[PDB]
């Protein structure tokens, strides 16, 4: 269903599009008679940049025969930010345009990044808080298969809407790892995929939530 690869990173979101019908080369930028434009956001909230200015801001465009990759700084204007109860998620609606005389090629993708979700843990459960945003959670995938809502409870997943969206996981589902940051171990999940009904489509985010200590150690 999805062909581009979206990766949320610390300071950066990477979009990689395959060249299904385009024949663009790395040379075809910063050259006469052709131009790249980066748009982030929707409608009047959409922020438009010529590639030159975007490069100055820390964007990077990479092209080879197989794919077109755009690295987007997480503070790019047009990103929509959702903070609630110290939990943080943001969305990136990208349109990347190559234009020549009488022709345009447009790569489109809408990313959900949620590295700073608030994660609380007690004796029996891990609890994620997901800020309210246009996405409605419809599936949770630990790796093997995509668990729909009507099967969450049986598989140890419990949703609570008393405030915002709290997603609970039985401690039995959690992995353990040693840690020197939250001494001397912490529970966590690896490559948890959350899928949302987001503005009429299915869109996922991948996260590695870990329980947090009140005061962690760091030098």
Ligand X SMILES: *[C@@H]1O[C@H](CO)[C@@H](O)[C@H](O)[C@H]1NC(C)=O
Ligand Y SMILES: *[C@@H]1O[C@H](CO)[C@@H](O[C@@H]2O[C@H](CO)[C@@H](O[C@@H]3O[C@H](CO[C@H]4O[C@H](CO[C@H]5O[C@H](CO)[C@@H](O)[C@H](O)[C@@H]5O)[C@@H](O)[C@H](O[C@H]5O[C@H](CO)[C@@H](O)[C@H](O)[C@@H]5O)[C@@H]4O)[C@@H](O)[C@H](O)[C@@H]3O)[C@H](O)[C@H]2NC(C)=O)[C@H](O)[C@H]1NC(C)=O
Ligand Z SMILES: *[C@@H]1O[C@H](CO)[C@@H](O[C@@H]2O[C@H](CO)[C@@H](O)[C@H](O)[C@H]2NC(C)=O)[C@H](O)[C@H]1NC(C)=O
Q: Is 168 in the site for ligand Z (CB under 6 A)?
A: yes
Separation CA 203–CA 136 (nearest Å) = 10
Among 136, 153, 177, 181, binds ligand Y (CB under 6 A): 153
**Minimum distance from residue 97 beta carbon to ligand Z (Å):** 45
Binding mask 52-91 for ligand X (x = CB under 6 A): ------x--------------x-x----------------
Q: Is 173 in the site for ligand Z (CB under 6 A)?
A: no
**Minimum distance from residue 130 beta carbon to ligand Y (Å):** 14
- What Cα–Cα distance (Å) separates residue 108 from each residue in 66, 98, 194? 17, 12, 21
Q: How would you class 112 by CB atoms within 10 Å of its CB: exposed for 0-12, middle for 13-18, buried for 19 or more?
A: buried
Q: Is 11 in the site for ligand X (CB under 6 A)?
A: yes
Task: Kindly give, in sequence order, each residue whose CB lies less than 8 Å from that of residue 49, ignoring residues fewer than 6 positions away.
Answer: 37, 38, 39, 57, 59
Most distant pair of Cα atoms in the chain: their distance = 63
Report residue 133 CA to chain centroid gap: 13
Q: Among residues 48, 75, 66, 50, which one has the least CA distance to residue 4?
A: 66
Handedness of CA 160, 163, 165, 171 (dihedral sign): negative
Which part of the chain contacts ligand Y (CB under 6 A), choosing from 44-52, 78-86, 88-96, 121-129?
A: 121-129
Q: Is 156 in the site for ligand X (CB under 6 A)?
A: no
Residues that bind a copy of itself in the complex, under the rule CB under 8 A: 1-4, 17, 19-26, 28-29, 98, 100-109
Handedness of CA 83, 85, 88, 91 (dihedral sign): negative
Separation CA 18–CA 180 (nearest Å) = 40
**Minimum distance from residue 127 beta carbon to ligand Y (Å):** 4
**Minimum distance from residue 27 beta carbon to ligand Z (Å):** 55
Q: Is 85 in the site for ligand Y (CB under 6 A)?
A: no
Partner that binds at residue 208, options ligand X, ligand Z, a copy of itself, none, CB closer than 5 to 8 Å by kind: none
Q: Is 155 in the site for ligand Z (CB under 6 A)?
A: no
Contacting residues toward ligand Y, per CB under 6 A: 122-125, 127, 152-153, 158-159, 168
Contacts with ligand Z by CB under 6 A lie at: 122-125, 127, 158, 168
């Amino acid at each position: 269903e999805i062909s581009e690869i979206v990766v949320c990173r610390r300071d950066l979101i990477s979009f990689s599009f395959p060249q299904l019908f385009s024949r663009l080369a790395d040379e075809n930028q910063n050259v006469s008679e052709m131009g790249w434009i980066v748009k982030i956001g929707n409608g009047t909230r959409a922020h438009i940049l010529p590639l030159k200015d975007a490069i100055v801001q820390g964007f990077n465009l990479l092209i080879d025969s197989q794919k077109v990759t755009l690295h987007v700084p997480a503070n790019a204007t047009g990103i929509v930010h959702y903070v609630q109860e110290s939990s943080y998620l943001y969305t990136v609606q990208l349109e990347l345009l190559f234009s020549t005389t009488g022709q345009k090629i447009v790569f489109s993708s809408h990313a959900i990044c949620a590295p700073d979700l608030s994660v609380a843990c007690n004796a029996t459960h891990m609890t994620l808080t997901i800020p309210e945003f246009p996405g409605k959670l419809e599936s949770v995938d630990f790796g093997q298969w995509s668990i729909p809502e009507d099967q969450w409870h049986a598989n140890g997943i419990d949703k609570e809407a008393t405030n915002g969206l709290r997603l609970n996981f039985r401690k039995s589902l959690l992995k353990t790892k040693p840690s020197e940051k939250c001494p001397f171990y912490q529970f966590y999940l690896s490559s948890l995929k959350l899928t949302f009904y987001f503005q009429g489509n299915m869109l996922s985010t991948v996260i590695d939530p870990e329980c947090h200590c009140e005061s962690p150690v760091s030098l």
